[PDB]
């Protein structure tokens, strides 16, 4: 519960930074693509951003319905929203938008990207889906496990495994970290245990250039927290959310991750 | 200096590597063994090839002054009484990240059983087209079943020492590494300076070895193994020949091991 809340604060400040930048740029028709939305934990964040149109997509059809339902519920207590079930690493989302020439101001992709580094075609496909329809000046923002921190911990271990009572990471073998299909197990004890894939961030950065994007920043969770905490509204939100200090086991689990922000060039 | 001791330790590491794949080549075929020493320098492995009893060697390096020194060292070797069987050699000055070596061989159709690239291939990661071209020169003319072997800095260990560093610099009295910015490690062009006290002050580029691995597939190569300098040493010491050899050439100082431990060895095999 406490980790889920900490990560929402991270996502809130990240989305909020770039929602603000879009609002200084655009005058109307703010449109967002939430690639890998899950059950919809960011719907509230997009409503607070006063955006105009949301596309929500995930590979789990059950998650897409729950996300749709949560939207309908909050509509009836707002942006227009679309809900598409699809593998964004194998399908073109352009094939499924109500309007196949719509463009986006932000693609947000939270804890989703690394599942596409199963293979070259899949990672390229998810990037296309996240950046191809970005308007000039648009943003591709997200969160994903920091490959360096995962390799560092795996080396320093004895087993192909490290973790604690919250999380366990088991690698399929050691010393072999292919650009694609480097598989490992992320055991969220006991929510989910999902196959994940390593993302060498310099690879992702170079790949995004195919879609005319440039790095805005790449920040470990630590860096992101330390910089974003100095802001006042960010600190206000942290207290208003019930958040103080992470426990050591929770810090270890969440320091695995980094945040990234790219921007569509002209 | 104690550069003398590092050189002799590095020569052991290269002997053990060269030897493993020479013996693999010697068995897969009966015949003449032909070798590409890419970035040969002054010819510090010429003796390793003479003990390997190979039949044809090609030495190439971007530095013409070093190529001539390597040729000069080869001709002195053949003035000895124990060089009846010594390989024949040709010496070419060329930028192997820019020029096609195929158009400079005496025989433009010749083929290699081994391309040996020791402490060279990281200079080519200046750009993609240079890393690609050095790999073409190293692997395209390899016979099927041939080998691409070498040594190069372990980028994971450079970045670990950098991140952990207090400034953009780390080293000791033997070496110093200075990057240009922390956090920004591009696939190509990641420049850092490498100063080996008294020996050499050169710019180098980071090689993400997984990227090197993938790019080598384009020339139909497959990884045989990659081992850090430590990992390689501990496995190879177990064999008595390797160890007897290590002692015929003491143990390593602290600041010396810190300097050699940045490196990894690799071996690729050309597929059929
Ligand atoms: N190939 C793929 N295409 C689209 N979504 C995928 C996917 N692979 C995994 N996912 C989705 O990515 C999600 C990861 S959990 C992240 C959920 C949400 N964005 C949040 O931050 O709370 C899961 O819902 C999973 O179904
Ligand atoms: N682009 C390039 N093409 C060919 N050789 C290069 C090169 N860039 C650097 N080199 C050579 O690589 C050498 C690295 S020093 C290594 C020397 C030798 N291989 C040995 O192990 O003893 C230098 O002599 C340098 O001239
Ligand atoms: O929300 C986060 C952030 C986070 C939370 C706690 C941590 F300890 C570290 C990170 N996630 C990263 C880890 C797995 C999370 C998750 N829950 N359910 C899933 N189903 C899937 O199919 C794929 C992923 C998940 C998604
Ligand atoms: O032999 C090794 C291995 C090694 C030696 C000592 C160590 F402490 C650890 C490793 N080298 C790596 C370091 C630079 C060496 C070198 N000497 N002269 C050069 N000229 C150039 O143009 C480029 C590189 C060099 C080559």
Numbering used by the authors:
A (entry chain B): 170 to 246, 252 to 419, 456 to 476
B (entry chain A): 167 to 415, 418 to 419, 456 to 476
From the primary publication:
RNA guanine-7 methyltransferase (RNMT) catalyses the transfer of a methyl group from S-adenosylmethionine (SAM) to the cap intermediate to form the cap m7G(5′)ppp(X) and the by-product S-adenosylhomocysteine (SAH). RNMT was identified based on homology to the yeast and viral homologues and in vitro activity. This basic cap structure (cap 0, m7G(5′)ppp(X)) protects RNA from degradation by nucleases during synthesis and recruits factors involved in RNA processing and translation initiation. RNMT has an activating co-factor RNMT-activating miniprotein (RAM) clamped at the interface of the catalytic domain and the modular lobe 416–456. Consequently, RNMT is a target of interest in cancers and immune disorders.
HsRNMT–Sinefungin–GMP-PnP, HsRNMT–SAH–DDD1060606 and HsRNMT–SAH–DDD1870799 co-complexes were solved, respectively, at 2.5, 2.0 and 2.4 Å in space group P21. The two inhibitors (DDD1060606 and DDD1870799) identified in the screening campaign were successfully co-crystallised with HsRNMT in the presence of SAH. DDD1870799 is also observed in the cap pocket of RNMT. In the presented structure, the pyrazolo-pyridine interacts with Y289 via two aromatic H-bonds, while the fluoro-benzene is buried in a hydrophobic pocket made by the residues including the main chain R173, as well as the side chains N176 and Y467. In comparison, the MIFs calculated for DDD1870799 suggest that the fluoro-phenyl moiety is responsible for the ligand binding via the interaction with a small pocket (S3) of high hydrophobicity. This interaction, by displacement of disorganised water molecules, is likely to be responsible for the significant gain in net enthalpic change ΔΔH measured for DDD1870799. However, a significant gain in net enthalpic change ΔΔH of −1.9 kcal/mol was measured for DDD1870799 in comparison with DDD1060606, suggesting that the interaction of DDD1870799 with HsRNMT-RAM is more enthalpy driven and might result in more selective leads with fewer absorption, distribution, metabolism, excretion and toxicity issues than DDD1060606. We report the structure of two small molecule inhibitors of RNMT as result of a diversity-driven hit discovery campaign. These molecules behave biochemically as uncompetitive inhibitors with respect to both cap and SAM despite the structural biology data leading to an expectation of competitive inhibition with cap. The biophysical data resolve this puzzle by demonstrating that the compounds require the presence of the enzymatic product, SAH, in RNMT to bind efficiently.
